[PDB]
Design a protein around this nucleic acid. Structure first.
Lengths: 125, 282, 445, 91, 50
RNA sequence: UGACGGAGCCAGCGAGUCUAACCUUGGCCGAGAGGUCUUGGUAAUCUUGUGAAACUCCGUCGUGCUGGGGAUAUUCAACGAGGAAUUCCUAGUAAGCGCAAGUCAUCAGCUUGCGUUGAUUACGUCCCUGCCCUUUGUACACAC
RNA sequence: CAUUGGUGAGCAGCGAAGGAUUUGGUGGAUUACUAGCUAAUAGCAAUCUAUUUCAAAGAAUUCAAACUUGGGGGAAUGCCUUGUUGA
RNA sequence: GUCGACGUACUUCAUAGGAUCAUUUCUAUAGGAAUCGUCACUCUUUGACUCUUCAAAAGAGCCACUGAAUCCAACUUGGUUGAU
């Protein structure tokens, strides 16, 4: 009976599942808050889906991210991709489509690796 | 193309099992073809069944490279990736250089952090045909693995008496023209299968006056690889030894790419059987 | 296969060595190279046109190559396939470079910008994503799945709100200035967007027929009975004569040949859209035919920065007191076609080139497109060529450096020169040389 | 063999090549009746375009493209069975 | 079993994936009591058992 | 780009009732075979699953290297990033870092995988060194 | 310590002589609005009948007609075509 | 290294006796068994229909008028001298 939206972010072998539901405003990564993401010089890589679009988008939803695998920087990249596409998917589903593709324009103008990972590599030259 | 190549493998090995299953029909059809040729009686099993004869009316109008290379044997020239094991030493990178000079239409790929599954996927969707993986032992290159890519066979060889074109002397550059090939006394059926594997990674149809030859000479299950250039003088031929020389021994031939190691083995070297050192191409 | 439209012949036939069926093609600007991509092969076959051979086969897609295009300026190949991937091949000049761009869902309908800087794809989500080529980033998308009129068929058991059949665009085309996109698909709405604001300009209903299938969103529930709809009963045995009592519709046939062999009503669909290279129109290949839409300016008063003192009476007063430049730009600001025509024929020949040099830079595409769509049909050939020579000599550096602005106005000028004026000149040149031969030689006995 | 042209061409062969039977042999349904129900209900597309009649004949190349439509409840429920459901791309 | 995992075909739909469910690791949750009894006994049931 | 000393935190491969030391000092039981117990020394990439290392953070110190026989309770070897030359290399690439396996050939003086961190510079040109191809357009328009 | 698992017990808040959920029937729409019937240039609509009958017009050597068959092999007795014998 | 001839060694090939069924009576045999205008009861097999489970999926869609059912709230009645 509650609205909930699950998305996935991935880098090299990291994986990050984000559950977005209608809540009080709390963002958690692996149970601890989002302000305790290590290695603390990439905390703004985690913070940029939030600050790109303002915390008033997040002030009614509460996200939680379970991250597994990879190393430090793979984990912060999977976290930020999960946060970004989770917020866009919640806005498609339970808020209006105008806000959904405004969020898509904001994240894609910053970098579209917040929404689409680079998936199949390499090249045979 | 993942779904398509999966079910194309599924259909080809279904057809393979069907042909080995009903290839008694091929030979009893040949029996009644030769019995209508020379008017001799039909054996009792064929004389009493009415089905195979009224099918022979249709099957009368039925009737060399092997199954993996048949669709594009002489049509398309190969494309070959040559790569090393992982974190290669410098004599192994020199050897991979020399092997990509050995095969035309072969480029060299740098190996490191390349999982062999997605290296097989990347190779066989960018459309190469062969992959040659080289293994070292402190400089000395010890193995090479030849993989034919549209779900074809991998022959794994071990290299034995390796002398390199770097390690001799500063002798100049190689020829890089499309070479002739010499395949010596590959007499058994495994030898013919390995001849097909080994020669479908050269460009088809060299020139008749092409001056570069490269020989695979089987001498007691030890395929001696030499490369030569020549000029046909007035009394004989004067042969000059360019390029690396070694001896490769086939120790495995299986029927998938490198990535699975669940492929059905066609021939792997039975080393500790009782009759291990009596027969060749065992 | 290539067709020469001068001798009406098929002068080349390109085949692959694989015998596959091609579903899209794209030609080089300077028609050296023709590429074509199938729906069952994943390669893109590149043949040369002069020598008829297969030049190469570009591999790297892992799904059927849905649409191809060649960039008309820098000659790069944009392909796009059902593996959710668009892919940019630099073919010419020692590079052999491939650049993959991932997209959200599987691409049908790629179109390239006229200046070759960008490429807009349609996707099966029903979105149009516009990518830069040189820095392969998403310049912007349009969300296009809610502004689509997908009808309900007579035979389907799911609503039009829930049908997933035709909520996407399978063919798109840029405008020739590069600022709009027309699009259509297997639905009965053709939509045209403008790309800089990413908004829907207008959505056209391609048919209001009920004898076609996908028209109504909401079917009449008087036709639904206690066994099936009433438009699924085949009353083809009540027909008067055998040749249409015959049921020759072999069963699972979709999109084969010969409409009698299908058993179902023809669906309404658009397979290709195109913007006109000369005059402000598009054409869409529906099932009823090539629907051709265009704007005429006899209607729709649409002025351009007029003021309180700019009037039809004020324009003809300035024309009667013969300020011809003032009268002409008052006609442009009214933007009434009869006023532009009246002043344009009241200016005299001695001061065509003064007026034509002193038309402002903003009213220049207006006068060029007016002279184009006027002089196609009007009989004042020497007047219109006088005006064209004056305008091109006056401001033909501005046109050259604003190419895509005057690209559908200058291209209808050389639909007037080479198609009526050069034909007239060919006739008189024939008369000149027949006269010279018939009076300069000796027909004696 | 060429006697397959007389022995083993058969209406049941042409029927085994239908779309609900291809669905069932691809495990995309549990039985041929449920495959007929699912594509009457309009879940199954081949390639990009939705297919709606059960009589469609699905050739050897074209059975690599039988999928469900996106946004289908059946695609949603198998992804969420394996809890790989990504609600970003509608399913 | 490795052959089956390679030939999985991920558009596979059996109706019992409305009852069966998969944990976070990806494996299968088998309810170790029954599946003929319900795991959570309702409040009137717990009233009577207590 | 150090040296100590804490703290934080991140993988992916790998599951055959199978996986793994040696040399001693002694007590007792036993016919012997041997058993048990006790003891010291040498070797060690731990033993099957939990986990890494680089990394991040925090306190302290503070930047001219090394020897045996002689003297009291200083002086007689190698080396402080490696010459001429030569080789290899274009993106998840070079390089760093650990962790597992040990697959009928090869490998343990190691070999092969597996992840983790991840760039500089070319991505043009035939000028040099080379190698190769063509020198009737043929192939059907148009153009050259 | 999570449950983004069931079942309950209650608050805050919402809150005009009540609220929520499900369901049977009928009506209007679901295409663009010129009235009913018949033997119809008019009758009727309370009725067509005790004028509803006559006349006239009207009959292709087309005195041809399965465009309609699942495939291979046959067809005694049929059936079709052609010939023929006796009337 | 290739085929003949001999020697050797091996594989395959038997169908009788009898009965029954097969001709919209009669399978050729008299050694065999069956010709009837329906009244009811019980038992058994099968199929519909209505609902439904594994186990879902799709709703010929909207608006109105009316009727019914269930859960709360409320009121009334019975209830610690004992409701469930």
């Amino acid at each position: 009976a509650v609205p909930s939206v699950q998305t996935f972010g991935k880098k090299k072998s990291a994986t990050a599942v984000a559950h977005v539901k209608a809540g009080k405003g709390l963002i958690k990564v692996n149970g601890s808050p989002i302000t305790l993401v290590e290695p603390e010089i990439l905390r703004f890589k985690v913070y940029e889906p939030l600050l790109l679009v303002g915390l008033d988008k997040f002030s009614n939803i509460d996200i939680r991210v379970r991250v597994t695998g990879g190393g430090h920087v793979s984990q912060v990249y999977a976290i930020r991709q999960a946060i970004a596409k989770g917020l866009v998917a919640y806005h498609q589903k339970y808020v209006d489509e105008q806000s959904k593709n405004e969020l898509k324009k904001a994240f894609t103008s910053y970098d579209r690796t917040l929404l689409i990972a680079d998936s199949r590599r390499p090249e045979p030259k | 193309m993942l779904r398509r190549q999966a079910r194309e493998r599924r259909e080809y090995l279904y057809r393979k099992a069907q042909e080995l299953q009903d290839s008694q029909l091929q030979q009893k059809r040949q029996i009644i073809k030769q019995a209508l040729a020379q008017g001799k009686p039909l054996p009792k099993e064929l004389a009493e069944d009415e089905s195979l004869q009224k099918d022979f009316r249709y099957d009368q109008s039925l009737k060399q490279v092997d199954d993996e290379y048949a669709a594009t044997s002489g049509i398309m020239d190969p494309r070959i990736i040559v790569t090393t094991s992982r974190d290669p030493s410098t004599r192994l990178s020199q050897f991979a250089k020399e092997i990509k000079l050995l095969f035309p239409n072969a480029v060299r790929l740098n190996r490191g952090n390349y999982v062999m599954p997605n290296l097989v996927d990347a190779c066989k969707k960018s459309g190469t045909t062969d992959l040659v993986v080289l293994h070292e032992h402190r400089g000395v290159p010890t193995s090479l693995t030849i993989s034919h890519f549209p779900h074809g066979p991998t022959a794994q060889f071990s290299l034995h008496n390796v002398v390199m074109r770097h390690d001799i002397i500063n002798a100049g550059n190689q020829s890089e023209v499309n070479p002739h090939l010499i395949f010596d006394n590959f007499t058994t059926a495994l030898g013919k299968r390995v001849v097909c594997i080994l020669k479908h990674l050269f460009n088809a149809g060299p020139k008749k006056d092409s001056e570069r030859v490269i020989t695979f000479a089987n001498r007691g299950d030890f395929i001696s690889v030499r490369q030569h250039v020549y000029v046909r003088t007035r009394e004989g031929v004067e042969i000059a030894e360019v390029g690396p020389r070694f001896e490769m021994r086939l120790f495995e031939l299986r029927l998938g790419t490198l990535e699975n190691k669940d492929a059905d083995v066609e021939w792997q070297l039975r080393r500790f059987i009782r009759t291990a050192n009596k027969k060749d191409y065992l | 296969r290539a067709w020469d439209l001068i001798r009406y012949r098929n002068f080349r036939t390109f085949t692959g060595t694989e015998r596959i069926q091609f579903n899209c093609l794209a030609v080089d600007p300077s028609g050296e190279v023709v590429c074509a991509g199938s729906l069952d092969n994943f390669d893109i076959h590149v043949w040369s046109v002069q020598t008829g051979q297969l030049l190469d086969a570009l591999s790297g897609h892992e799904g059927p190559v849905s649409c191809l295009s060649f960039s008309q300026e820098n000659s790069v190949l944009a392909s796009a396939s059902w593996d959710k991937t668009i892919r940019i091949w630099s073919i010419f000049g020692r590079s052999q470079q491939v650049e993959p761009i991932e997209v959200y869902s599987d691409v049908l309908a790629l179109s390239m910008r006229p200046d070759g800087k960008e490429v807009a794809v349609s996707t099966l989500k029903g979105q149009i994503s516009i990518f830069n080529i040189e820095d392969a980033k998403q310049v912007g998308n349009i969300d296009c799945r809610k502004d689509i009129i997908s009808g309900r068929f007579n035979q389907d058991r799911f609503t039009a709100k829930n049908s997933e059949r035709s909520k996407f665009f399978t063919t798109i085309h840029y405008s020739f200035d590069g600022m709009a996109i027309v699009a259509g698909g297997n639905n009965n709405s053709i939509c045209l967007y403008d790309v800089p604001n990413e908004v829907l300009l207008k959505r056209f209903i391609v048919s209001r027929n009920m004898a076609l299938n996908g028209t109504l969103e909401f079917l009449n529930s008087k036709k639904m009975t206690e066994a099936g709809s009433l438009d699924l009963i085949d009353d083809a045995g009540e027909n008067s004569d055998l040749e249409d009592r015959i049921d020759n519709s072999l069963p699972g046939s979709q999109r084969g040949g010969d409409l009698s062999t299908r058993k179902m009503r023809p669906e309404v669909r658009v397979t290709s859209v195109q913007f006109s290279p000369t005059a402000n129109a598009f054409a869409a290949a529906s099932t009823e035919g090539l629907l051709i839409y265009s704007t005429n300016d006899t209607i729709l008063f649409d002025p351009f920065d007029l003021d309180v003192d700019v009037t039809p009476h004020s324009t003809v007063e300035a024309l009667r007191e013969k300020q011809f430049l003032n009268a002409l730009v008052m006609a442009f600001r009214l933007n009434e076609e009869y006023l532009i025509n009246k002043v344009y024929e009241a200016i005299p020949i001695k001061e065509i080139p003064l007026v034509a040099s002193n038309i402002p830079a903003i009213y220049l595409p207006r006068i060029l497109k007016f002279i184009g769509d006027f002089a196609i049909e009007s009989q004042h050939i020497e007047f219109n060529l006088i005006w064209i020579k004056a305008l091109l000599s006056a401001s033909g550096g501005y046109i050259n450096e604003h190419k895509y602005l005057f690209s559908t106005a200058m291209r209808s000028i050389q639909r007037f020169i080479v198609r009526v004026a050069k034909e007239v000149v060919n006739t008189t040149t024939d008369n000149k040389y027949t006269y010279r031969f018939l009076v300069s030689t000796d027909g004696s006995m | 063999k060429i006697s397959d042209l007389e022995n083993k061409v058969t209406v049941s062969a042409i029927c085994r090549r239908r779309l609900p039977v291809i669905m069932h042999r691809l495990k995309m349904a549990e039985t041929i009746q449920d495959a007929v129900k699912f594509i009457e209900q309009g879940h199954v597309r081949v390639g990009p375009n939705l297919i709606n009649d059960p009589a469609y004949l699905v050739t050897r190349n074209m059975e690599d493209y039988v999928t469900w439509v996106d946004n289908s409840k059946i695609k949603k429920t198998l992804l969420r069975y394996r809890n790989q459901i990504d609600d970003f791309d509608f399913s | 079993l490795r052959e089956k995992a390679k030939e999985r075909n991920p558009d596979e739909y059996y109706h019992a994936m409305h009852s069966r469910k998969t944990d976070a690791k990806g494996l299968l949750i088998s309810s170790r009591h029954g599946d003929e009894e319900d795991e959570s006994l309702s409040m009137d049931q717990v009233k009577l058992l207590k």
